[PDB]
Design a protein around this ligand. Structure first.
Ligand SMILES: NC(=O)c1ccc[n+]([C@@H]2O[C@H](COP(=O)([O-])OP(=O)([O-])OC[C@H]3O[C@@H](n4cnc5c4nc[n+]4cc[nH]c54)[C@H](O)[C@@H]3O)[C@@H](O)[C@H]2O)c1
Ligand SMILES: NC(=O)c1ccc[n+]([C@@H]2O[C@H](COP(=O)([O-])OP(=O)([O-])OC[C@H]3O[C@@H](n4cnc5c4nc[n+]4cc[nH]c54)[C@H](O)[C@@H]3O)[C@@H](O)[C@H]2O)c1
Ligand SMILES: O=P1(O)OC[C@H]2O[C@@H](O[C@H]3[C@@H](O)[C@H](n4cnc5c4ncn4ccnc54)O[C@@H]3COP(=O)(O)O1)[C@H](O)[C@@H]2O
Ligand SMILES: O=P1(O)OC[C@H]2O[C@@H](O[C@H]3[C@@H](O)[C@H](n4cnc5c4ncn4ccnc54)O[C@@H]3COP(=O)(O)O1)[C@H](O)[C@@H]2O
Lengths: 473, 473
C-alpha cells in the first residue's frame, strides 16, 4: 500500500484507463534512467565553446541559441550531438514496458528517443508515430496507440525543437500539433510523467486551454518527485526549495493539473505496476470440472456456482471460462441471470469450449494458454472428472494452475470444493509467501477460510469475492 | 569626327541597331552622373559600424556581407539605404534619353534605379520591366523595349543583389535570368555602357557562353574610359594602372568583347548622339512643288527628279514625300524604278498626300509636322505653284523648312532649282554656322555648289547625294 493520495490517484486513473480515455504525456525525464546522458552533459562542450559553463546555466534553450548565434545560425554540431546520443541502443526500462502494456492509445512526448515506440513494438502493438505535420493526415490501420513526438524525432535532428528559434516558430510551423494537443487536453485525461513543466510550448498550450475553458478545465494528473536535500546545501536552502516546489505545484493546479508528490522515481514504477494490476485482475479465469461435488449435493453446488458467477458479474468482473464439464453451464447461467436484466457483452463473458477429438487435443495446450492469458486472477473449483466410471481428480485443472502461475496470475483455489482445488489450496498454503508475498493478515485469514467446509453458499461466496477484490483493488 | 576606332564602332553599331538586333547592357556607372551618391559613400557608415573603412575597401559586396554577418544576417539597414538613395527624383541625363530614342528593344541593367524606365516613358514608349522570375512569363502588348533589371528593383530592396549571399544564390534563384542573358548574348549584339566587368554573375555568364561557343562567340562592344593620372599618384603608378587596364581589355577580348577606350565620359554621349544621327538621317524628306521648273525644261527637270529619287533609294535612304504638285509623281516614279527589280516596301517610300478641302487644311499643319517628324534630312526642290494663272513661289515649302529647322533636321535647299528653294539656300548661306556648326571645307564647297545652274543632272544629283551622305555617314 502507498499514500492515500497515491491510492486515490491510482483508483481514478485506473478508472480512466479502463474507459480508454486516458493519455500519457512523457517528458525527457522518463528516459533519463535508461542510460542516455543528460542534455546538460551533451551541451557542456557546446557551452565551453561560447565561453559559458553549462553547470552555471539553467536555460539550456538559450544556451543552444547562443551557440547557434556564435556560428551564424548553424545547427550541424547540435544535430550531430543529439543524433549520436539519443539514437543509441539502450535496454527499455520497466516504465516504458508497463505503459506499453496498458490500454493507452495516446502518447505525447517531448523526448527525441524512440523508447516508447520500441516498448510498443515489443508488445506486438501497432504504433502510429507522428512528428511531422504531414504525418497527421495519414492513420495506420489497426493501430493500438498513436505517439505524437511534438519536439521531433532523433532520426531527424534538424527538425528537433532545441533552440529559442524553434520555440518561437513552433506556433506557426507546428500549429496542427498545438491544435491536436489542445483537443486531447480537453477530451482526454492526461498523466504527465517525467515532465518538468518548464517547456514554453506546453505553457502556451495550457494557457490557451485555460483561457478557453476557465474553471471547467478537465482534470489531469502529474507525477513529481519531492525535493531532496543536497549534500552541500543547508537546511534553510532545502526548506526554501521545498516551499518553491509547493508554489510550483499549486500553480500547476491553476491549470487543473493535480500533482502526486513521490519520494523517489521508483514510485513511478510502483504506481504503473499497481494500475496494470488493477486493470489485469478485473478479468477472472473460472476453472474446474465436477461430476461429484465433494460434500455438497449436486443442486446445492450448482446454486453455489450460479450465485458465485452472478456476484462476479455484479462486482464488475469479466469472467473467462473453459466450459468445463459440470461447471461451465452453471457459470453461464449465472452470467445470463446477471446480464439479462439485455444482451451478452463480449467483454463480460468469454467462453472457450475445448475442441473435442484427436485434432483438438494437439492444440489444447496453446488454447489453454491463450484462454488464461486474457485473465489476471484464476479461480479453481472442484476438479473431478469421470474416466472409467469412478470419480478421478482432473489433470486439466493442474495444467491451468501451472499456466496461471507461469503468467504471474493470482490463484484462488477454493479448498472447500475439494479434489484438485483442495490439492492446489494445500500446495499454496505449503509455500504462501511464494504466491502471495507481503500478504496482510486479512488476506491470510481469507485464504485460510477458503478451505472451510462449514461455510454456507453465501459465506463462501462472500469470502471468495472479498479475496478477489483485495487482490484487485 | 572622332578616333578611327570610334568611327568604325559607330558604323558597325549603327548597322546593328538599324537591324533591330542590338541590346544595351547598362551598369551602375551609367547612373553615376545623374546625381545619385556613390555606393561606397552609402556604405561608409556601414563600413564604420563594423570597424572597417570603405575607402580602404575595394570589394563592397564582401563589406556588405560582413555587415550582415555582424547583424545575424539582417539586411534592413542596407535595404533602407538603397531605397532612400536610388528612389529619389533626379533629372534624366542625356545618355538615357538618347538610348530611349534609339530603336533598341533589349536593356539589361545591374542598376536598381528606374532611369531607363523613365527615359523610355518620356519617349512615349511602352517598357516591359522585368526583375522577378514570374515577370518573365508575361509580356506587355505592343511593348517597345524590355528591361531586365537583373540585380533587382529599387522599390524591392530586399531582393537586390548586394551581398555575397545574393551572388551565391543567384545561380539558383535567378537561373531563368541567366538563361535569358545567355540567349541574348548569343543572339544579340550587346553594348556595355557603365559596366566595370567586376560582377561575379556577369563573369559566370560570360564564362559559360565562352565555354559553350569557343572561338565562335558573337562580338560585343564595351565603352571604357582610359585611366587618368590622380593628383597624388606618380608617373610610374599611372603607367602601371594604364598597363593593368590594357591587360584588363585583352581579357575581355577573350570573351570577344571589343573595348572602345574613351578620353572622358562625355564621349559616351557623343557616340550615342552620332549613332542617333546616323539612324535618323537615313530618312530624307523630299519637299517641293513646281509648275515652272526655273531654267530647266519640264522633261529635263522631271528626269532630274526621277534620277535623284532613284539614287536616294539606291543609297539606302528612305524617302518621305508629301506628294506635292509637279514633284510627287516623279519621285514616285524614281522609287518605283529603283524598287521594281518587286513590291513597295513601306519603309523605303512613305507617301502622305495632303487632304483637299476645307476640312483638310484645318489639320494640314499637324499632318505636315507628323510627316516631317519621320525624317532627319529635308531636301527642298523648286517651290513654285499657280494661284491666279501666274507662277508664284509656294508657301507650304517655307512651312516645311520651318518645321524641319524646329526639329533640328538637316536642310538641303537646292538653289539651282530656284524659287523657294533658292530663297532657302540664300537664307542658309546668310547664316551658315547657325544651321551647319563646325562644317568642313568639303561641306561648304558642296553647299555652295548646290546653287550652280551650270551643273548637269548627273553633277547636281551627285552633289546632293554626297552632301546628304556626309550629313548622314
Ligand atoms: O524536457 P522536460 O521538461 O520534458 O524534462 P527535463 O527538464 O529534461 O527533466 C526534468 C524532469 O525530469 C524528471 N526526471 C528526472 N529523472 C527522472 C525523471 N522522471 C522520472 N524518472 C524515472 C527515473 N529517473 C527519472 C523530473 O521529474 C523533472 O521534473
Ligand atoms: O559593375 P557596375 O555595373 O556595378 O559598375 P560600377 O562598378 O558601379 O562602376 C564602375 C564603372 O562605372 C563607370 N562609370 C563611372 N562614372 C561613369 C561611368 N560610366 C559612364 N558615365 C557617364 C558619366 N559618368 C559615368 C566606369 O566605366 C566604371 O567601369
Ligand atoms: O476435467 P479436466 O481434466 O480439466 C478441467 C478443465 O478443462 C476444461 O474442460 C475439460 C472437460 O470438462 C471437457 N470435456 C467435456 N466433455 C468431455 C471433455 N473432455 C473429454 N471427454 C471425453 C468424453 N467426453 C469428454 O474437455 C476439457 C478438456 O479436458 P481436460 O482438460 O482433460 O479436462 C475446463 O477449462 C476445465 O477447467
Ligand atoms: O505648293 P505649296 O505652297 O507647298 C508645297 C508643298 O506642299 C505639299 O503639296 C501641296 C500642293 O502641291 C498640294 N496640291 C495639289 N493640288 C492642289 C494642291 N493644293 C491646293 N490646290 C487647289 C487646287 N488644286 C490644289 O497641296 C499641298 C498643300 O498645299 P500647300 O502646302 O499650300 O502647297 C507638298 O508636301 C509640297 O512639298
Amino acid at each position: 500500500k502507498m499514500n492515500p493520495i497515491v491510492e486515490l490517484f491510482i483508483k481514478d486513473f485506473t478508472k480512466e484507463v479502463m474507459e480508454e480515455n486516458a493519455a500519457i504525456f512523457a517528458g525527457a525525464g522518463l528516459s533519463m534512467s535508461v542510460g542516455y546522458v543528460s542534455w546538460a552533459k551533451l551541451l557542456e562542450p557546446i557551452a565551453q565553446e561560447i565561453g559559458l559553463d553549462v553547470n552555471k546555466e539553467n536555460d539550456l534553450v538559450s544556451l543552444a541559441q547562443y551557440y547557434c548565434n556564435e556560428n551564424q545560425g548553424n545547427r550541424g554540431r547540435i544535430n550531430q550531438i543529439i543524433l549520436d546520443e539519443f539514437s543509441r541502443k539502450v535496454d527499455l526500462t520497466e516504465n516504458h514496458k508497463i505503459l506499453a502494456r496498458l490500454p493507452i492509445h495516446t502518447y505525447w512526448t517531448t523526448a527525441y528517443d524512440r523508447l516508447i515506440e520500441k516498448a510498443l513494438e515489443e508488445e506486438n502493438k501497432i504504433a502510429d508515430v507522428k512528428y511531422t505535420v504531414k504525418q497527421l493526415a495519414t492513420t495506420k490501420v489497426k493501430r493500438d496507440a498513436v505517439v505524437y513526438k511534438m519536439h521531433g524525432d532523433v532520426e531527424h535532428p534538424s527538425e528537433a525543437v532545441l533552440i529559442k528559434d524553434d520555440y518561437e516558430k513552433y506556433s506557426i510551423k507546428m500549429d496542427p500539433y498545438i491544435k491536436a494537443l489542445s483537443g486531447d487536453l480537453v477530451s482526454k485525461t492526461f498523466l504527465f510523467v517525467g515532465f518538468s513543466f518548464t517547456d514554453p510550448n506546453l505553457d502556451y498550450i495550457l494557457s490557451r486551454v485555460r483561457s478557453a475553458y476557465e474553471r471547467d478545465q478537465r482534470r489531469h494528473y502529474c507525477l513529481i518527485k519531492k525535493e531532496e536535500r543536497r549534500p552541500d546545501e543547508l537546511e534553510a536552502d532545502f526548506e526554501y526549495r521545498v516551499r518553491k516546489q509547493e508554489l510550483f505545484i499549486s500553480d500547476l493546479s491553476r491549470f487543473n493539473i493535480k500533482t502526486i508528490v513521490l519520494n523517489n522515481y521508483n514510485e513511478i514504477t510502483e504506481i504503473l505496476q499497481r494500475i496494470e494490476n488493477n486493470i489485469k485482475t478485473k478479468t477472472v479465469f473460472l476453472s474446474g470440472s465436477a461430476v461429484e461435488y465433494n460434500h455438497w449435493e449436486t443442486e446445492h453446488a450448482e446454486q453455489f456456482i450460479h450465485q458465485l458467477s452472478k456476484e462476479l458479474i455484479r462486482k464488475d468482473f469479466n469472467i473467462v471460462s473453459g466450459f468445463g464439464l459440470g461447471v461451465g453451464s452453471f457459470v453461464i447461467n449465472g452470467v445470463l441471470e446477471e446480464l439479462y436484466m439485455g444482451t451478452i457483452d463480449d467483454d463480460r463473458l468469454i467462453l472457450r469450449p475445448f475442441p473435442q477429438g484427436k485434432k483438438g487435443e494437439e492444440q489444447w495446450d496453446k488454447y489453454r494458454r491463450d484462454m488464461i492469458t486474457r485473465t489476471g486472477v484464476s479461480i479453481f473449483l472442484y476438479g473431478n472428472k469421470i474416466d472409467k466410471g469412478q470419480v478421478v481428480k482432473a489433470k486439466g485443472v493442474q495444467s491451468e494452475f501451472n499456466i496461471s502461475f507461469e503468467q504471474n496470475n493470482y490463484v484462488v483455489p477454493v479448498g472447500a470444493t475439494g479434489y484438485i482445488a483442495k490439492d492446489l489450496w494445500n500446495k499454496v498454503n505449503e509455500e504462501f509467501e511464494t504466491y502471495y508475498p507481503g500478504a496482510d493478515a486479512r488476506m491470510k485469514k481469507l485464504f485460510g477460510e477458503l478451505n472451510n467446509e462449514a461455510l454456507s453458499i453465501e459465506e463462501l461466496i462472500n469470502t471468495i469475492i472479498e479475496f478477489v477484490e483485495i487482490l484487485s483493488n
